RNA sequence: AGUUCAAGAGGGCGUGAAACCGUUAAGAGGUAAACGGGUGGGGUCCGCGCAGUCCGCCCGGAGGAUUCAACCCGGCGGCGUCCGGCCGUGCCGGUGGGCGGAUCUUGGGACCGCCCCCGGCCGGCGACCGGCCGCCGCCGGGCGCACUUCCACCGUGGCGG
RNA sequence: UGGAAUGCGAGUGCCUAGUGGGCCACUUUUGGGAAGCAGAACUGGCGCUGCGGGAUGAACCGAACGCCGGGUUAAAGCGC
RNA sequence: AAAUGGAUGGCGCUGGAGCGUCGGGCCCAUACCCGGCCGUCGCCGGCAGUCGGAACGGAACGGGACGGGAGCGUCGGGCCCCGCGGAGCCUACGCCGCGACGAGUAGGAGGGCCGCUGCGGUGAGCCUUGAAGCCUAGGGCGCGGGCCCGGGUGGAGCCGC
């Protein structure tokens, strides 16, 4: 094994921004959040906003 | 949308069980507990769930209200039905059919109620 | 009592014996686990008469009785009481097998809960 | 990913996809581009005509900076100014014509592929093509040379 | 060696290149060190523009 | 008995190789339409949804305007299973109703500023389930660089196909075989 | 004999495989063994094996307890030009005062395109909210006090699986 | 009047591994007394292929193969 | 006339079990026919119509004259009802139907709920009331790669998606 193996990957900035938008949109759907096992019950609103 | 979310959780979920050639789903409002678009208890605007009562007698029927689809705390209305077996089946049948509330799930709710009521009656060897 | 399945079809097996690896009888280093012989002169690969049979897709069992136990049920491995409740609505075709790593205290709970859910347990007497 | 590769499916096959007769030897042919004239002179002639030989005259100490002459065609000439510039200029009734300074956009020579709208324009560039100048005049514009 | 259509490639790997391979795993480290040098210099010449 | 099996399995796409769930929903929609409707338009659209990106070349705005200006094409919807790109060599854009999978931002701005309408394939199903009043367009499939290298070999007499060349100049595959003064020129 | 939970942890001592060997038990033995396919015999183990099913409806016998059916009160749901707040395209009026522009200047400005906001008009509910008015359903309470309803038993009961 | 019969769905692009020692038989055929020798043509085959028959056998005769039950044949057989 | 003793395959066969020409029976292949099961390939194959009213071969409107009727001038007839009710379905990457086919070295491709080690998530996972590992005439699953459970030993970690 050699140290000059490719360890690092570069992703396009537009694709990285795309992934964040998709992650944010999914975080507002309670079905997807419960499918992560996040125990969102008794939570008043899934897009929880506090002062 | 139900179909959009189903394409996300179809094979990737915390409730998904894959084991010895069969698949199950353990979300709380899934009658028959099967990984299917029709029976998934999280992705629809109206779902029906049948669970045993808090104590050992009766059936609690859960229904998703139309409003507050993004409000988990108030999304579910639960009714405790504790009467004889034939009356319990009739009440669940009327809630699904007379309201036109998910008539696709009528028999599945009734079978699950019979299983729960049977499991509550004493076991004699 | 003995819980019975919804249907009990006649299970037909095309072969009950196991396919053994070639020359696994002659050597200890050669385990009986099947290997396809890729030898230029191999007579098992060439299908000579009176030799070790090679598995092929023709031996596959009926899809109506595939993975069926002799009792008529199909087995589902279970580790706790909650996993047992997944078989509430398929208890006439599926049975629960408790995993070997489940302790003695937890087996009593799974067996007791399965008894009142009409879920057949393959191994209810283990670790009694 | 090593789990998606052919080696995983080549376990148990005595020859690793390389044959029993010819085998996988070190360098059955030459090394690199060896034998391009002797035993690989079908591959070289079929797929690389012109590979061998000398053509042209050498030029020592070539500095590409003085041969720098970026080009722009007439079909992209109006993209070097804003859309509002072209619309306002067309709607104007007098003979006033907007100026596109091609050198300001990083092009030196203007070529004449395409066609121009019937809208007079003053174009500044270091070099012009013969057909480019004729098309700018035909629309009603002028070609201005800049050093 | 050649197989049907392709490019005549001439890689420069005939010269024991593995002894001289420059890996850039210290690249993030030299960014922090350059940055801390700039900040220290700016404080040392504080009123002066530090550019 | 006495048959050949080397051509029994037809090699074609029966589903998109993509995992894009939004494309999978349109494939679900147009799979239903191709089955329950006698329209051959829905069958062609379903095939192109499966196809790869090289088989779905971008369609220039200029070419769509060219093809939608032909006689009898007025008040019809241009359907592209692919991307609609902007052409800067076109200065006037008329009003067009275009349905496409993707539209570039500048193309969408120019189409909308002209008074046109952009539709997705789910809105096209709602408006024209049969595919009536549409013009089914496609980008140039052989309009990409790999096809300059394909075909009759460069070192073969009447071939005009581009060789695979590392760098372009006087010293790169120009002497022997490309010139009567150096060996030959076919 | 003793220590230790354990000497099946006893100073190259965690676990302790295979090759090879000793012993016990069983079986067999003149074509070297070993193998594939069929059976047959014997043996170890297994089957809450050893009087064999379990569900639904109906029919009788006798027992128990009552809510049921309907009606009244309260609570919660589901559905739909009636109203209001939103989300909005387009469309005008700007306190706008905003971002840009290879538009004009007479840096400051004017002009244009958008962005958001304000007011008026204009379309649609589904990952977008309320309120009347009905219709339907469920739950709790009351009354309903027995030819209704429900719960268990028996028949070697009948139909379906 | 889709201008003979019969049968069949076709066309086309890219990338491409292994191979580039062969051998046998009917017929034809060159050298050699000849050879289970050397060299050719056509077709089939063995090599890559097991199965029934030729006692045995790479190539002959029959026939080509997913796991099975019934029936019937091929080539070859039916004293043991 | 050829060298170990030996080969119509052997034994043996002579009103034939020899030679030639023929008949009728009969025996056997993985070939042929019928049937079952597995897979592969093909059908631009079927299913979003989960409905108690529902379904292929035409429907929807308004003008005049008419006959079959319910009514005794209305074609209203998504609204029907002494039952208020009617199995399963559709992980659409799912399910279902029909037809044909299945040899394989070198080699190519696909699938793998086959297996090994480590990482990110997840299983309100398992575990000193016993993890890993090892042994097994035990019960089984899968065409197979392998896997699950019972029992013994062991003593601290391990696995599913």
Curated annotation (Swiss-Prot), chain B:
Protein name (Swiss-Prot/TrEMBL): Large ribosomal subunit protein eL28
GO MF annotations in UniProt: structural constituent of ribosome
Naturally occurring in which organism (per UniProt): Mus musculus
GO cellular component: cell body; cytoplasm; cytoplasmic ribonucleoprotein granule; cytosol; cytosolic large ribosomal subunit; dendrite; postsynapse; presynapse
Principal place of residence: cytoplasm
InterPro entries per the UniProt record, alphabetical: Ribosomal_eL28 (IPR002672), Ribosomal_eL28/Mak16 (IPR029004)
Example of a GO biological process term: translation at postsynapse
Keywords: Acetylation, Cytoplasm, Isopeptide bond, Phosphoprotein, Ribonucleoprotein, Ribosomal protein, Ubl conjugation
Residues where N-acetylserine is found: 1
Subunit structure comment from the entry: Component of the large ribosomal subunit.
Subcellular location: Cytoplasm
Keyword Glycoprotein: no
Disulfide links within the chain: none
Swiss-Prot record, chain C:
SUPFAM superfamilies in UniProt: Ribosomal protein L32e (SSF52042)
The UniProt record lists the keyword Cytoplasm: yes
Keywords, alphabetical: Cytoplasm, Isopeptide bond, Phosphoprotein, Ribonucleoprotein, Ribosomal protein, Ubl conjugation
A biological process term (GO) from this entry: cellular response to dexamethasone stimulus
Cross-link Glycyl lysine isopeptide (Lys-Gly) (interchain with G-Cter in SUMO2) placement: 8
GO MF terms held by the record: structural constituent of ribosome
Pfam families: Ribosomal_L32e
Superkingdom of this protein's organism: Eukaryota
Subcellular location: Cytoplasm
PROSITE patterns in the cross-refs: RIBOSOMAL_L32E
Record PTM N6-succinyllysine, positions in chain: 49
UniProt-recorded name of the protein: Large ribosomal subunit protein eL32
Organism: Mus musculus (Mouse)
Species classification: Eukaryota, Metazoa, Chordata, Craniata, Vertebrata
From Swiss-Prot, chain D:
Pfam families per the UniProt record, alphabetical: Ribosomal_L27A
Disordered: annotated segments: 1-36
Comp. bias regions, Basic residues: 1-29
Modification type (3S)-3-hydroxyhistidine: residues: 38
Post-translational modification: Hydroxylated on His-38 by MINA.
Localisation per UniProt entry: Cytoplasm
GO molecular function annotation: structural constituent of ribosome
Family under the similarity heading: Belongs to the universal ribosomal protein uL15 family.
HAMAP family for this protein: Ribosomal_uL15
Oligomer and partners: Component of the large ribosomal subunit.
Name the UniProt record assigns to this protein: Large ribosomal subunit protein uL15
Organism: Mus musculus
From Swiss-Prot, chain E:
Subcellular location: Cytoplasm
Location of N6-acetyllysine modifications: 15
Modified residue annotations for Phosphoserine: 51
Family: Belongs to the eukaryotic ribosomal protein eL13 family.
Assembly, per entry: Component of the large ribosomal subunit.
Function per UniProt: Component of the large ribosomal subunit. The ribosome is a large ribonucleoprotein complex responsible for the synthesis of proteins in the cell.
Name this protein carries in UniProt: Large ribosomal subunit protein eL13
Gene (UniProt): Rpl13
Residues of the full protein shown: 2 to 52 of 211
């Amino acid at each position: 094994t050699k140290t000059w193996r490719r360890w690092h990957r570069r992703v396009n900035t537009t694709q990285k921004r795309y992934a964040i938008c998709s992650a944010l949109a999914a975080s507002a759907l309670p079905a997807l959040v419960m499918s992560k096992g996040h125990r969102i019950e008794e939570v008043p609103e899934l897009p929880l906003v506090v002062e | 949308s139900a179909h959009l979310q189903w394409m996300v959780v179809r094979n990737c979920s915390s409730f998904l069980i894959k084991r010895n050639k069969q698949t199950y789903s353990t979300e709380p409002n899934n009658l028959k507990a099967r990984n299917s678009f029709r029976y998934n208890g999280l992705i629809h605007r109206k779902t029906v769930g049948v669970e045993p009562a808090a104590d050992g007698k009766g059936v609690v029927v859960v229904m998703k209200r139309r409003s507050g689809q993004r409000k988990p705390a108030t999304s579910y209305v639960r009714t405790t039905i504790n009467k004889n077996a034939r009356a319990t089946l009739s009440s669940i049948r009327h809630m699904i059919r007379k309201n036109k509330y998910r008539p696709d799930l009528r028999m599945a709710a009734i079978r699950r109620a019979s299983a729960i009521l049977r499991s509550q009656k004493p076991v004699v060897v | 009592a003995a819980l019975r399945p919804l249907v009990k079809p006649k299970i037909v097996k095309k072969r009950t014996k196991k396919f053994i690896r070639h020359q696994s009888d002659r050597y200890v280093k050669i385990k009986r686990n099947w290997r396809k012989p890729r030898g230029i002169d191999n007579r098992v690969r060439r299908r000579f008469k009176g030799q070790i049979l090679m598995p092929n897709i023709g031996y596959g069992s009926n899809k109506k009785t595939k993975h069926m136990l002799p009792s008529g049920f199909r087995k589902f491995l279970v580790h706790n009481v909650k996993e047992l409740e997944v078989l509430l609505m398929c208890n006439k075709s599926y049975c629960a097998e408790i995993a070997h790593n489940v302790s003695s205290k937890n087996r009593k709970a799974i067996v007791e809960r399965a008894a009142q859910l009409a879920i057949r347990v393959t191994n209810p007497n283990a670790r009694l | 990913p090593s789990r998606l590769r052919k080696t995983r499916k080549l376990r148990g096959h005595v020859s690793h996809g390389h044959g029993r007769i010819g085998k996988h030897r070190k360098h059955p042919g030459g090394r690199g581009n060896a034998g391009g004239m002797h035993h690989h002179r079908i591959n070289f002639d079929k797929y690389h005509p012109g590979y061998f030989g000398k053509v042209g005259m050498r030029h020592y100490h070539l500095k590409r900076n003085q041969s720098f002459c970026p080009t722009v065609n007439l079909d992209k000439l109006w993209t070097l100014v804003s859309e509002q510039t072209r619309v306002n200029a067309a709607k104007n009734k007098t003979g006033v014509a907007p100026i596109i300074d091609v050198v300001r956009s990083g092009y030196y020579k203007v070529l004449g592929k395409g066609k121009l709208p019937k809208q007079p324009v003053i174009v500044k560039a270091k070099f012009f093509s013969r057909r480019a100048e004729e098309k700018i005049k035909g629309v009603g514009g002028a070609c201005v040379l800049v050093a | 060696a050649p197989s049907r259509n392709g490019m005549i490639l001439k890689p420069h790997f005939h010269k024991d290149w593995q002894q001289r391979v420059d890996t850039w795993f210290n690249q993030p480290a030299r960014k922090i060190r350059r940055r801390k040098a700039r900040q220290a210099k700016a404080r040392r010449i504080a009123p002066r523009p530090a550019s | 008995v006495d048959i050949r099996h080397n051509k029994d399995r037809k090699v074609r796409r029966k589903e998109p190789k993509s995992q894009d769930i939004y494309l999978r929903l349109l494939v679900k929609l147009y799979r239903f339409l191709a089955r329950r409707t006698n329209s051959t338009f829905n069958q062609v659209v379903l095939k192109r949804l499966f196809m790869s990106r090289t088989n779905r070349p971008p369609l220039s705005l200029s070419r769509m305007i060219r093809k939608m200006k032909l006689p009898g094409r007025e008040n019809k919807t241009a359907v592209v299973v692919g991307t609609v790109t902007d052409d800067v060599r076109i200065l006037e854009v008329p009003k067009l109703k275009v349905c496409a999978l993707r539209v570039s931002s500048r193309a969408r701005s120019r189409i909308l500023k002209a008074g046109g309408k952009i539709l997705t394939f789910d809105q096209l199903a709602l408006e024209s389930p049969k595919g009536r009043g549409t013009v089914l367009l496609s980008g140039p499939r052989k309009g990409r660089e790999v096809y300059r290298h394909f075909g009759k070999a460069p070192g073969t007499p009447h071939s005009h196909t581009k060789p695979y060349v590392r760098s372009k100049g006087r010293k790169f595959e120009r002497a022997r075989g490309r010139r009567a003064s150096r060996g030959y020129k076919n």
